[PDB]
Each structure stands twice: as structure tokens, then as C-alpha cells.
């Protein structure tokens, strides 16, 4: 069930899906830029229109089995205010940033340092406070923050942040520990909203973990796959199911590299979870 024959057949099915989902020049399946402002950080990594969160972000609602998340690109400088609006309206129980510290510091990559420092974005002001640091194994460290998002006359929303300061391949072990940390962080924050009687708890489009790396299709997809396998409601959901759900709901590049698919395969194998649909 996890041998070369099963793996070749899984890659056959997934590659076919990537071909089908490849974006056309003005593809109606994908979000297009409204005005002379770049929407996609990468021109070939586009945002599914039916599941888009905001018209000016490369960001998608994704449900894999029962697991509800948002996957997005690292926001462009011009998208910061809209990005914080997504975070606050979602009542984000955890923001998982999988771009490393050295990548964020690389100014040629154009990733603004929006969660490690305070700032002002239009009418929104953001305060950053560092909290715990959690080791993930193999020398990998997660720095955690609280982001407090304020706007005059609006409700103040604070967002837990899990920042993985280095990605190297990340082993299935580190990915497993990361999914547990992200899920636990989300659970603690969600329970707080529940204890306040928040109406967002019953809202299908809210209280979703937000995950992004740089483009939101590689490390992001690896983590989302691991979180859905950490969800006890997803028994019998196959790896084919998981990746195809991510691709139809964001783009055909979700799980971009063979190394990332191999992590998901190993995690499934450890659970006895099927690779293929029968």
C-alpha cells in the first residue's frame, strides 16, 4: 500500500490534477488583479476564485476532510492592511508563518516583517509581543507572538502567531510536532472565544488557522496535510483525497515538491492511512 507501485499511481493522479488545474491567461477559475496592483507573489501560483477570502489577497479557504483552514501567500507590502483585516475578521486562533527568519530578512524576497514588529497599516495599528519559544526537534525552533490588531471604533483582536524560524526537507517528526503546536495554539484561542459566547464559533468561515510560507503551496501544504491527519474526525481520508482537496480549493501546486509529498506519505503510513482511493 506504500510501495513504489502505489506511489507511482498517486503521483499519476496528482500530476493529472495539476495539469487540469493549470491556469489559463485570464482564467475564470482564479482571482485576477483589480487594477494596476500585483496580486500574485508568483505569476504561476494563483488563487482559486470560488474559495478566495478577499478580492485583493492570494488566500483561500480550505477544508480537508473536516479540517478547516486558510492558506495564503506571504502578503505583499501593498496587501498588509487587507491581510490584517482577514486576520481580525476571521478571529484567527493561530497564524502559522513557515517562512524562515533569514528568508524574511532577505530584502530581495520582499516579505515584510509584519508580525515581529509593531506597525500601522492604513487605519489599522498592530502591536507585536513575543511569548514562548517551543522546540520542534532537530534544532528547529518556533518563536511565538501575540499580534494585537486595533482600529478606532472596532473590536480589538489578538492573534497567536507560530513562527518557524528555520525550515531546512523537514522531517515527518518536526512536521508532526509543528501540527500539534499549531492545533494546540488554535484550540486554546478558540476556547477563549467560546467562553465569551462568540458567534464566530458557529461561523464556518471564521476561527480558521491561517498558514503561509512564501507562496503558500509548499511548506504550507505539508503542514495542512499533517494537521488534517492530526484531526480525529478524518479517519479513512486518503492522501489522494487530502492533496486533491487542497489543489481544487487553492491551486494545482499545493504540495509543490516531491519531498513534501513524501512527508505526507510517511505520516499516512505511520497511521495506516490509505494513499489511494479504491
TrEMBL record:
Domain Tyrosine-protein phosphatase: 1-261
GO molecular function: protein tyrosine phosphatase activity
Cell location: Secreted
Residue ranges annotated for the Tyrosine specific protein phosphatases domain, each copy included: 176-261
Known EC number: 3.1.3.48
Top-level division of the source organism's lineage: Bacteria
GO cellular component terms given for this protein: extracellular region
Keywords: Hydrolase, Plasmid, Protein phosphatase, Secreted, Virulence
Keyword Hydrolase annotated: yes
Chief location: secreted
Example GO biological process: symbiont-mediated suppression of host reactive oxygen species generation
The keyword Secreted is annotated on this UniProt entry: yes
Protein name as catalogued: protein-tyrosine-phosphatase
Gene this chain is encoded by: yopH
Amino acid at each position: 500500500p506504500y510501495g513504489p507501485e502505489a506511489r507511482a499511481e498517486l503521483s499519476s493522479r496528482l500530476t493529472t490534477l495539476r495539469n487540469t488545474l493549470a491556469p489559463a491567461t485570464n482564467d475564470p477559475r482564479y482571482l485576477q488583479a483589480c487594477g494596476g496592483e500585483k496580486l500574485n507573489r508568483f505569476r504561476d501560483i494563483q488563487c482559486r476564485r470560488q474559495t478566495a477570502v478577499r478580492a485583493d489577497l492570494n488566500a483561500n479557504y480550505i477544508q480537508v476532510g473536516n479540517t478547516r483552514t486558510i492558506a495564503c501567500q506571504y502578503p505583499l507590502q501593498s496587501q498588509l492592511e487587507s491581510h490584517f483585516r482577514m486576520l481580525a475578521e476571521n478571529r484567527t486562533p493561530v497564524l502559522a508563518v513557515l517562512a524562515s527568519s533569514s528568508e524574511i530578512a532577505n530584502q530581495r524576497f520582499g516579505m515584510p516583517d509584519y508580525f515581529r514588529q509593531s506597525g500601522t497599516y492604513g487605519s489599522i495599528t498592530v502591536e507585536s509581543k513575543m511569548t514562548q519559544q517551543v522546540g520542534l526537534g532537530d534544532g528547529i525552533m518556533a518563536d511565538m507572538y501575540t499580534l494585537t490588531i486595533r482600529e478606532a471604533g472596532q473590536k480589538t483582536i489578538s492573534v497567536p502567531v507560530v513562527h518557524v524560524t528555520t525550515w531546512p526537507v523537514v522531517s515527518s517528526e518536526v512536521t508532526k510536532a509543528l501540527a500539534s503546536l499549531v492545533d494546540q495554539t488554535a484550540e486554546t484561542k478558540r476556547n477563549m472565544y467560546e467562553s465569551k459566547g462568540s458567534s464566530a464559533v458557529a461561523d464556518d468561515s471564521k476561527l480558521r488557522p491561517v498558514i503561509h510560507c512564501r507562496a503558500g503551496v509548499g511548506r504550507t501544504a505539508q503542514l495542512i496535510g499533517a494537521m488534517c491527519m492530526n484531526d480525529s474526525r478524518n479517519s479513512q481520508l486518503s492522501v489522494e483525497d487530502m492533496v486533491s482537496q487542497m489543489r481544487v480549493q487553492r491551486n494545482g501546486i499545493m504540495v509543490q515538491k516531491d519531498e513534501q509529498l513524501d512527508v505526507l506519505i510517511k505520516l499516512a503510513e505511520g497511521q495506516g492511512r490509505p494513499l489511494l482511493n479504491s
